[PDB]
PDB file of C-alpha atoms (C1' of nucleotides) in Angstrom:
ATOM      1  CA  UNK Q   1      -7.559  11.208   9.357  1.00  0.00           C
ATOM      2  CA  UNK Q   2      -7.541   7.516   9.175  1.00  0.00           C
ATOM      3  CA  UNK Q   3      -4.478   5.554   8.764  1.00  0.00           C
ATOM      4  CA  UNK Q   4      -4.688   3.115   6.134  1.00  0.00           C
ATOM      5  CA  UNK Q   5      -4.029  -0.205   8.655  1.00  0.00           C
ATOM      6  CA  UNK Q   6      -7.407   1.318  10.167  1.00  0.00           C
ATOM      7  CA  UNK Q   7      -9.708   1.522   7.367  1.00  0.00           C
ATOM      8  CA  UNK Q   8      -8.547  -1.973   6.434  1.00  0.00           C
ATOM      9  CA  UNK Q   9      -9.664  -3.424   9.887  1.00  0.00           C
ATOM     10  CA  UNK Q  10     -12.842  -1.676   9.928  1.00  0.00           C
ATOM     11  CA  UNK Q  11     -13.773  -3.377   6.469  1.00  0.00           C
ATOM     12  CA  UNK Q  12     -12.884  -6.562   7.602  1.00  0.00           C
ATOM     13  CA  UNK Q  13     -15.129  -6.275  11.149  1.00  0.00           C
ATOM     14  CA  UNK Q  14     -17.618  -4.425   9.026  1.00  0.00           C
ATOM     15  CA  UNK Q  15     -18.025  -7.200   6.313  1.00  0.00           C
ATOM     16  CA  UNK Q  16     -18.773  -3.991   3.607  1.00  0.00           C
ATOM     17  CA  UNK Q  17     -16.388  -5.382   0.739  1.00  0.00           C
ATOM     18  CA  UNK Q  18     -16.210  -8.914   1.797  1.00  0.00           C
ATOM     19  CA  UNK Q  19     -15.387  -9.356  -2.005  1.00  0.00           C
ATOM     20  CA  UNK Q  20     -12.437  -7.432  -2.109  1.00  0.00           C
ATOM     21  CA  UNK Q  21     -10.568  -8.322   1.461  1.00  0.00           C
ATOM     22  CA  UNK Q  22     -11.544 -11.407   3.280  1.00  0.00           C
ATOM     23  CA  UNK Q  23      -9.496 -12.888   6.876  1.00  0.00           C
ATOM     24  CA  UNK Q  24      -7.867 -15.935   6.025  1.00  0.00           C
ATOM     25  CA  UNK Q  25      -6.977 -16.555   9.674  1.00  0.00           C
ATOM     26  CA  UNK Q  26      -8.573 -14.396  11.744  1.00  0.00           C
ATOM     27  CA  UNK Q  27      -7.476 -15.310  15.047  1.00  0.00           C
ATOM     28  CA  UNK Q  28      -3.367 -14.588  13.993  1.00  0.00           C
ATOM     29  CA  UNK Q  29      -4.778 -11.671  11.651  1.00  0.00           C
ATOM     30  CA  UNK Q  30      -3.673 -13.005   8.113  1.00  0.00           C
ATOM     31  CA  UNK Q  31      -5.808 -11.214   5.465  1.00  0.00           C
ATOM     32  CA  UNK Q  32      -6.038 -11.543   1.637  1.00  0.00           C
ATOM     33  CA  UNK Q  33      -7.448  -8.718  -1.234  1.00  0.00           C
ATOM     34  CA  UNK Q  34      -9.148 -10.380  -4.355  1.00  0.00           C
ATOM     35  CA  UNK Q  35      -7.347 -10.581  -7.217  1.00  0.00           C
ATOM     36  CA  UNK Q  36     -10.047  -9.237  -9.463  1.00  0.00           C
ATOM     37  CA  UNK Q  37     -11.819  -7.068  -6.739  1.00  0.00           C
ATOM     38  CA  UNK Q  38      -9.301  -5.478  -5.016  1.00  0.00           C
ATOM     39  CA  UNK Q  39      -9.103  -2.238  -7.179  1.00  0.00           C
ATOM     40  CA  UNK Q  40     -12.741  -1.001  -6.330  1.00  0.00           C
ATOM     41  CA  UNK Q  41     -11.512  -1.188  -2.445  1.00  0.00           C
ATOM     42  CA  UNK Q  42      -8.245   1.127  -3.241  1.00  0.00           C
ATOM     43  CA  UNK Q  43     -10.767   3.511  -5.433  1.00  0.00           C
ATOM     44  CA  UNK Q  44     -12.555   3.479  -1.882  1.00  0.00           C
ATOM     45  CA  UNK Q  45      -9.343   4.477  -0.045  1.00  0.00           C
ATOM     46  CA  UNK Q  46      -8.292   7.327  -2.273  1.00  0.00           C
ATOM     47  CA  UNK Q  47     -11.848   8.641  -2.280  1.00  0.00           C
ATOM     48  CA  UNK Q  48     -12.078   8.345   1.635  1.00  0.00           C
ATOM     49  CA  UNK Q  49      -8.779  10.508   2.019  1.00  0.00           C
ATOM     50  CA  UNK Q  50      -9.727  13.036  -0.726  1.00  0.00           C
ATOM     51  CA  UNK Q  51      -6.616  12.289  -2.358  1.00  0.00           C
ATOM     52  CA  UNK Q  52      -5.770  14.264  -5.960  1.00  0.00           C
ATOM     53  CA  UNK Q  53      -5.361  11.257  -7.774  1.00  0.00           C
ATOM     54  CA  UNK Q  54      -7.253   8.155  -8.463  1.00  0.00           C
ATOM     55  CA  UNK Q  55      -5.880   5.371  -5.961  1.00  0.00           C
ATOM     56  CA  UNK Q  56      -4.982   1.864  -7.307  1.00  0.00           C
ATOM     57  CA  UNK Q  57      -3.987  -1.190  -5.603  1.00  0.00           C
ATOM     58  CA  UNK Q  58      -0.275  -0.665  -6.623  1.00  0.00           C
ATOM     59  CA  UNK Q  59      -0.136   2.799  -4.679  1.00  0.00           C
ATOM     60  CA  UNK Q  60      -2.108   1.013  -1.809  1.00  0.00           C
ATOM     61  CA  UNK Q  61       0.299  -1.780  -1.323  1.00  0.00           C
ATOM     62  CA  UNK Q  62       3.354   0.551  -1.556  1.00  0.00           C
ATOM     63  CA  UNK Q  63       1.886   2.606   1.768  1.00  0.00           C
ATOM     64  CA  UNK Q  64       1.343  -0.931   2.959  1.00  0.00           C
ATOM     65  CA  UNK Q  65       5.255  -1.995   2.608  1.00  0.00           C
ATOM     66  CA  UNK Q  66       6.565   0.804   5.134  1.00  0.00           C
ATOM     67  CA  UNK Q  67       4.446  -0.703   8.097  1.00  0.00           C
ATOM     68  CA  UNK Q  68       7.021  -3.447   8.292  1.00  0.00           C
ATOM     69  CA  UNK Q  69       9.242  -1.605   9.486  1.00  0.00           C
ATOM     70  CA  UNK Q  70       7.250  -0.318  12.654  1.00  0.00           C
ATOM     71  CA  UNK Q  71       5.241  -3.534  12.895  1.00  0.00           C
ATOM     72  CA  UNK Q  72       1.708  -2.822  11.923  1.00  0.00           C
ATOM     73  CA  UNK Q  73       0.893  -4.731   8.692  1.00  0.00           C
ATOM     74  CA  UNK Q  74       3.352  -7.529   7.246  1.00  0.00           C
ATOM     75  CA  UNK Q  75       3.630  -8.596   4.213  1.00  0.00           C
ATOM     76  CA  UNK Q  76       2.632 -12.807   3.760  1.00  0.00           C
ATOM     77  CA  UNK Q  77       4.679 -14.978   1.660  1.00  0.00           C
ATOM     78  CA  UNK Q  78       1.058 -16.309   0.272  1.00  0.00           C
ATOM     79  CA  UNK Q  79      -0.717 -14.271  -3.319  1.00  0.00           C
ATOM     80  CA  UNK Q  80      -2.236 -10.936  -1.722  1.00  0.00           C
ATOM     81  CA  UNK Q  81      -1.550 -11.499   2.058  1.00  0.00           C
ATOM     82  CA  UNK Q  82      -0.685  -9.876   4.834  1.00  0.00           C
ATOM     83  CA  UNK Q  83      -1.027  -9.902   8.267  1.00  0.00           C
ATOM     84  CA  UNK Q  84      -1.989  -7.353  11.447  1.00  0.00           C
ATOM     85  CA  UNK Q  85       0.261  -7.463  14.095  1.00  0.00           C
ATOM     86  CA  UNK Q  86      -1.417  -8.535  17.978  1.00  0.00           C
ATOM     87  CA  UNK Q  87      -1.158  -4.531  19.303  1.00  0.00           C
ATOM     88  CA  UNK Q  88      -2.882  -3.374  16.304  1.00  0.00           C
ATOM     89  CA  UNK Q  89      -5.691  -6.453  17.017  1.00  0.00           C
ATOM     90  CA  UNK Q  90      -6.152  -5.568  20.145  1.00  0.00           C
ATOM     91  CA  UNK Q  91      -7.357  -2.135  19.372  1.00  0.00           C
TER      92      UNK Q  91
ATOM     93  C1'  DA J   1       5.349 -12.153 -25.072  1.00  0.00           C
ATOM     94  C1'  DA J   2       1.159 -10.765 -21.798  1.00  0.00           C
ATOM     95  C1'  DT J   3      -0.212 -10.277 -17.355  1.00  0.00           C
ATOM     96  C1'  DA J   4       0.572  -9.335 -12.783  1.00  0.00           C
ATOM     97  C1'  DA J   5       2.446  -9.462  -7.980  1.00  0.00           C
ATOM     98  C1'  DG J   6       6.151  -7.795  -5.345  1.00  0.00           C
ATOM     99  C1'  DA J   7       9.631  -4.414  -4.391  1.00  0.00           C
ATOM    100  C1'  DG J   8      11.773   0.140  -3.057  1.00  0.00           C
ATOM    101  C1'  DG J   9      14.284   4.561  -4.095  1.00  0.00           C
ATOM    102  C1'  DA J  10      13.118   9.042  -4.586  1.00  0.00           C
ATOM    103  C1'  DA J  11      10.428  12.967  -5.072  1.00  0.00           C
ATOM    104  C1'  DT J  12       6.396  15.188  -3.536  1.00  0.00           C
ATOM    105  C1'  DG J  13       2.410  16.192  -0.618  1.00  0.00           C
ATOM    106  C1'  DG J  14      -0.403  16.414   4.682  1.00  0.00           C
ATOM    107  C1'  DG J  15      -0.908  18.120   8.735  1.00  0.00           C
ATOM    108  C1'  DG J  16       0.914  19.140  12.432  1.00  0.00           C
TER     109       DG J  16
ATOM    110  C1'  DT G   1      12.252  22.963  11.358  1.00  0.00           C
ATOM    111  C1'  DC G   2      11.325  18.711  10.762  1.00  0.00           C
ATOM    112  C1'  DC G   3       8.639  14.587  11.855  1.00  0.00           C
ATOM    113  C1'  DC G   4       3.880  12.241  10.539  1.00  0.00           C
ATOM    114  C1'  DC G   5       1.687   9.415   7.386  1.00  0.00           C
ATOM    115  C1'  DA G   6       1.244   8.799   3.231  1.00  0.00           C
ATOM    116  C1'  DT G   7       1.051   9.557  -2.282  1.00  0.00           C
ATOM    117  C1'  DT G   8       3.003   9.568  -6.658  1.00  0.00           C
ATOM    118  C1'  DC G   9       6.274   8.391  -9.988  1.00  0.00           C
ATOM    119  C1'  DC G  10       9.555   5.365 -12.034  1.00  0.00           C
ATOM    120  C1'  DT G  11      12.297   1.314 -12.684  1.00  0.00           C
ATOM    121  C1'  DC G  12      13.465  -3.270 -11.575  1.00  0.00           C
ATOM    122  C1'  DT G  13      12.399  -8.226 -10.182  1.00  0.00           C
ATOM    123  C1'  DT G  14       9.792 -12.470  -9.891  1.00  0.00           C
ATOM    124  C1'  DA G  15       6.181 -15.572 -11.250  1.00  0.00           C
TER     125       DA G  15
END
DNA sequence: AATAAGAGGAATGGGG
DNA sequence: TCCCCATTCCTCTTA
């Protein structure tokens, strides 16, 4: 199954919810969700992974949180941003 | 207050 | 057995 940091790369190269997640520096990987939109792209998660429960933005960004441990995704200390890390760009 | 982002401990669930 | 990779729930903090 998909990991999470995944399907949020592949919508950003893909363009396919450019309403809900945008780059705001693409070249060091700093991304942003919408603050109005960014619900419809965790329904999209939750329904992707077949999850039991509806998904919401909240749950979303609390997977998001234990990547910064390990490297993946970090948390930006802009509204709604975070950043890849350069391995995880490079794939 | 109302709204909302940010946080994480802890329990629970996936699929090896 | 016990780590993977979350999901779900709850409470607290900050803006």
């Amino acid at each position: 199954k998909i990991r999470l940091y995944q399907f949020l790369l592949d919508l950003l190269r893909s363009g396919d919810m450019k309403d809900s997640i945008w780059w705001v520096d693409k070249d060091k990987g700093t991304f942003q969700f919408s603050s109005k939109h960014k619900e419809a792209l965790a329904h999209r998660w939750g329904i992707q992974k077949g999850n039991r429960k509806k998904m919401t933005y909240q749950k979303m960004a609390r997977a998001l949180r234990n990547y910064g441990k390990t490297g993946e995704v970090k948390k930006v200390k802009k509204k709604l941003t975070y950043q890849f890390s350069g391995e995880v760009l490079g794939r």
